[PDB]
Design a protein around this nucleic acid. Structure first.
Lengths: 217, 170, 99, 45, 116, 119
RNA sequence: AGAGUGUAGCUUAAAAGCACCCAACUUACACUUAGGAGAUUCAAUUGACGCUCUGA
């Protein structure tokens, strides 16, 4: 049987920004700070605050506030880098900073003749080619950039085989170390997706079942 | 001169090549559990035992306990471990539900069936109540296997039981 | 060299007199109790989620290796082969504010 | 899930106070850390 | 007794194993001993995350040889915890590493370095 | 006057009693037995029993053990049984729920120590 | 479209027992102690609700 030999890849972005907390985690975190304070053992900061004003009361009867005030105003000096470049953009699907707290997945339109499918990015392999090397060739081909990804193993992640000439489709999983993603406004249709749009952009059984090996968290 | 074992040897099926891949008894208590289970099983060697030996109910019960755990004083009392149990409700409902099987155990332990009927076991369905008059104020009850003096049992007892003919025997 | 830093500093002995006062109320320990109860609920639901993910992904990769085995008997031998690029494998933890 | 190993407490008992001082190394990258004398921000030059 | 069928019913030393390179021979491949260093400016997040790693490893049937810690350094102080691991699969290398990646709290880094 | 099985000195528990109180704490349920040396369960009280289960909040806590101690003790006074032996493991001895169980039994009317054999 | 079907994770358990989670002792694990959440898909042995496999 003539097998249409197809390789692919599922690209991952590790979130640089941590996730926000649950309100239950808020009450638990506050509780752990309370009970953490309750079992501490004479910090010198309060020894240079509590007994010092006692001794000043003894001197007046016969600075920690400046340190806190300087720390407060210097806290007001450096503004935080905002964790949300996410709602202001709202349509920068091609951009790498679409989301910061979740994982982001590369996802590319392909126009065929018998089909016209929005596909998790593929490649075509040769029996001489290593499957890991198929995915390595898959990296710096379609995007046309200077990224830096990272694989883990020659183990695959998700396999889907469709026919109309036999075929098979192999899904690996890479991981972006860094990215010199030059000219992000490409002619290509790469879109970064958290999890939810993967059920939106990808309808059929060979594509509505990708999320069962996407690291959902 | 080896003779081969008659049935299966113990510690045969768990005997593998990778013990470190086998999860172990981390405790003393689990070994005591498994160990008692293996004690109760019939074996082929000589052992000590040879020589010295409907839907509405679950519905109303689930809604009943579900209503029981919902009250705040029950949870607050139970977590402060000052909650108790009314012994009387448990007594009367025990008289109703599973009491007969327990009176069957007490009649089997006291040898009432091997002696009274040559082993013909049965189940005391009727929650009988017998008590002897102790003067005029109080009265000594007869439960299954109690101690009662013959002074208390000098006069024939009061018998009350909730039922609808009957022949009673002592 | 067996030098560790679990040894306690000597200064934490003498002036242990700042907080001898630990008093609460009934409803404070009630809400604390409800945080521990519902937080064990929350954490248990979390490990149910993660166990579901390891089950799903692990069966996904085993099914994948089965299909790759039965569709290419010279690629499942090399799918098991390990990478020498995973000796110095690193990843730093996430942050808050992007550079 | 970057919040599991964050909900912590000092598991020792011979420990002093710690205070959630936001640290930046060089990159405008803030992390909550606990340090002596309740600082609010840090920068290593 | 040596001639009875119940001979050796009381033996137990085959049930206790009363007693490094990687094993990647032809089909069954596994890493050798590892080291996972956890460095943080916090005792709490490093210890607690080392707990979460250790309880994962016990919950996924992995030999965890040690879970010791390294001494700190005068700099701020940098804390380290070393949680050794020996023996994974091809799939289980990926699935095992992705969770440790996807569970880091705050700025605490990893290492899949091996022994020596 | 009757014999107790005197032997069994290398093995836990001792078989030297006439009646034993054996607590079986499962994951869900506390259970309490009163047995002979035969293993003939004389008197039981479990929380797997509708009469006792419905008056409880949770079938496993210290309240469950104090409850099953009251119920077990009342059930054993009416069986003509006044002396058990309770032999716990040294962690189950120092548990709160078994101290509460023993206090329930002793306050109930049962002495948890048998009289000696008269030779 | 057909086929296999079905108790919470597992059960030739019948509303159970192990699994599971938090809290405490432990660097940590483990033990132990205190707690927590649990289910027989809906109607009459039978049909129809949900899953898996084979189809287009």
């Amino acid at each position: 049987s003539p097998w249409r030999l197809l390789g692919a890849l599922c690209l991952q972005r590790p979130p640089v920004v941590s996730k926000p907390l649950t309100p239950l985690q808020e009450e638990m975190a506050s509780l752990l700070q309370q009970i953490e304070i309750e079992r501490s053992l004479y910090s010198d900061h309060e020894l240079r605050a509590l007994d010092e004003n006692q001794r000043l009361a003894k001197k007046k009867a016969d600075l920690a506030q400046d340190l806190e005030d300087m720390w407060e105003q210097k806290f007001l000096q450096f503004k935080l880098g905002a964790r949300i470049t996410e709602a202001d953009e709202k349509n920068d699907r091609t951009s790498l900073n679409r989301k910061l707290d979740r994982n982001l997945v590369l996802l590319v339109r392909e126009k065929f003749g018998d089909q016209d499918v929005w596909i998790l990015p593929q490649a075509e392999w040769q029996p001489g080619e290593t499957l890991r090397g198929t995915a390595e060739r898959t990296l710096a081909t379609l995007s046309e950039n200077n990224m830096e990804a990272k694989f883990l193993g020659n183990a695959p992640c998700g396999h889907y085989t469709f026919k109309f000439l036999g075929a098979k489709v192999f899904f690996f999983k890479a991981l972006l170390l860094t990215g010199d993603f030059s000219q992000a406004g490409n002619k290509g249709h790469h879109v970064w997706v958290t999890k939810d749009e993967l059920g939106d952009y990808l309808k059929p059984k060979y594509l509505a079942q990708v999320r069962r090996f996407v690291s959902d968290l | 001169r080896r003779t081969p074992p008659l049935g299966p040897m113990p510690n045969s099926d768990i005997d593998l090549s990778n013990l470190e891949r086998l999860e172990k008894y981390r405790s003393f208590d689990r070994y005591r559990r498994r160990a008692e289970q293996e004690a109760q099983a019939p074996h082929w060697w000589r052992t000590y035992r040879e020589y010295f030996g409907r839907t509405q109910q679950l519905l109303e019960r689930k809604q009943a306990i579900q209503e029981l755990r919902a009250n705040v004083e029950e949870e607050r009392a139970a977590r402060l471990r000052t909650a108790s149990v009314p012994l009387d409700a448990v007594r009367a409902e025990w008289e109703r539900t599973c009491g007969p099987y327990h009176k069957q155990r007490l009649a089997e332990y006291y040898g009432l069936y091997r002696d009274l009927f040559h082993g013909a076991t049965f189940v005391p369905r009727v929650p009988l109540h017998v008590a002897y008059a102790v003067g005029e104020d109080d009265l000594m009850p007869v439960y299954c296997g109690n101690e009662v003096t013959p002074t208390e049992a000098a006069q024939a007892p009061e018998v009350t039981y909730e039922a609808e003919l009957w022949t009673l025997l002592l | 060299i067996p030098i560790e830093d679990f040894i306690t500093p000597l200064k934490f002995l003498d002036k242990a007199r700042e907080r001898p006062q630990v008093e609460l109320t009934f409803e404070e320990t009630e809400r604390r109790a409800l945080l521990l109860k519902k937080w064990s609920l929350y954490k248990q639901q979390e490990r149910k989620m993660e166990r579901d993910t390891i089950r799903a992904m692990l069966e996904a990769q085993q099914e994948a290796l089965e299909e790759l085995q039965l569709e290419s008997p010279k690629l499942h031998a090399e799918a098991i082969k390990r990478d020498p690029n995973l000796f110095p494998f690193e990843k730093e933890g996430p942050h808050y504010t992007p550079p | 899930d970057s919040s599991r190993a964050s909900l912590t407490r000092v598991h020792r008992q011979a420990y002093a106070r710690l205070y959630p001082v936001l640290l930046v190394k060089q990159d405008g990258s803030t992390i909550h850390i606990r340090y002596r004398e309740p600082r609010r921000m840090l920068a290593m030059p | 007794y040596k001639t009875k069928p119940t001979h050796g019913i009381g033996k137990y030393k085959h049930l206790i194993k009363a007693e490094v390179r990687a094993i990647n021979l032809g089909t069954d491949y596994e890493y050798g001993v590892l080291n996972i260093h956890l460095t943080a400016y916090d005792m709490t997040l490093a210890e607690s995350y080392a707990q979460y790693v250790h309880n994962l490893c016990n919950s996924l049937s992995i030999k965890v040889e040690e879970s010791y810690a390294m001494p700190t350094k005068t700099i701020l102080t940098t804390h380290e915890r070393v949680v050794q691991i020996s023996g994974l699969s091809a799939t289980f290398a990926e699935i095992f590493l992705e969770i440790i990646q996807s569970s880091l709290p705050e700025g605490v880094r990893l290492s899949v370095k091996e022994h020596t | 006057v009757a014999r107790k099985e005197r032997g069994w000195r290398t093995v836990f528990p001792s078989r030297e009693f006439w009646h034993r109180l054996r607590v079986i704490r499962t994951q869900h349920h506390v259970e309490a037995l009163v047995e002979h040396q035969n293993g003939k369960v004389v008197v039981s009280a479990s929380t797997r029993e509708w009469a006792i289960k419905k008056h409880l909040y949770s079938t496993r806590n210290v309240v469950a053990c104090e409850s099953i101690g009251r119920v077990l003790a009342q059930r054993c006074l009416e069986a003509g049984i006044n002396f058990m032996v309770y032999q716990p493991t040294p962690w189950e001895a120092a548990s709160d729920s078994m101290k509460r169980l023993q206090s329930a039994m002793t306050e109930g009317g049962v002495v948890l120590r048998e009289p000696q054999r008269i030779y």
